[PDB]
RNA sequence: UGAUGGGGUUAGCGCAAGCGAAGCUCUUGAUCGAAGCCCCGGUAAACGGCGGCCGUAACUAUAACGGUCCUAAGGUAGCGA
């Protein structure tokens, strides 16, 4: 399915057009998102390169 | 239906004037008085009626959302140049 926004979007192109995504702000082509390094919890069970026990 | 209230006439009383019973009259309307209407509900396959404005979401668009005024209620499903 197609969303409503998108439906009255499409009709208001067909009938003498916009094409208002031009007009939208441009994203960058990376990723955006909140970037944590990580927690005690997190590193302290990590668990890196299995070494076996003696 | 006619309780009263008022007037006309006059037997009589007052020498003018004026007062005036009864009767007969003209009028006034107390009371009595049902449906209806006002009132209280019900009824829309009874006649009928079924709203505005503004803001708002991943940089656009749109508004699920919210605000407010009014209403008897704000047009549901389905359909739609």
Redesign the pocket.
């Known amino acids: 399915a197609k ?4 439906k ?2 499409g009709h ?1 192109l067909r ?1 003498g057009g ?1 094409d ?9 082509s990376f990723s ?1 998102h909140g970037r944590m390094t990580k927690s005690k919890k997190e590193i302290l069970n990590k668990r890196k390169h299995k070494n076996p026990y003696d």
């Open positions: 969303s409503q926004a998108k009255k979007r208001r009938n916009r208002v995504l031009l007009s939208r702000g441009s994203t960058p955006t």
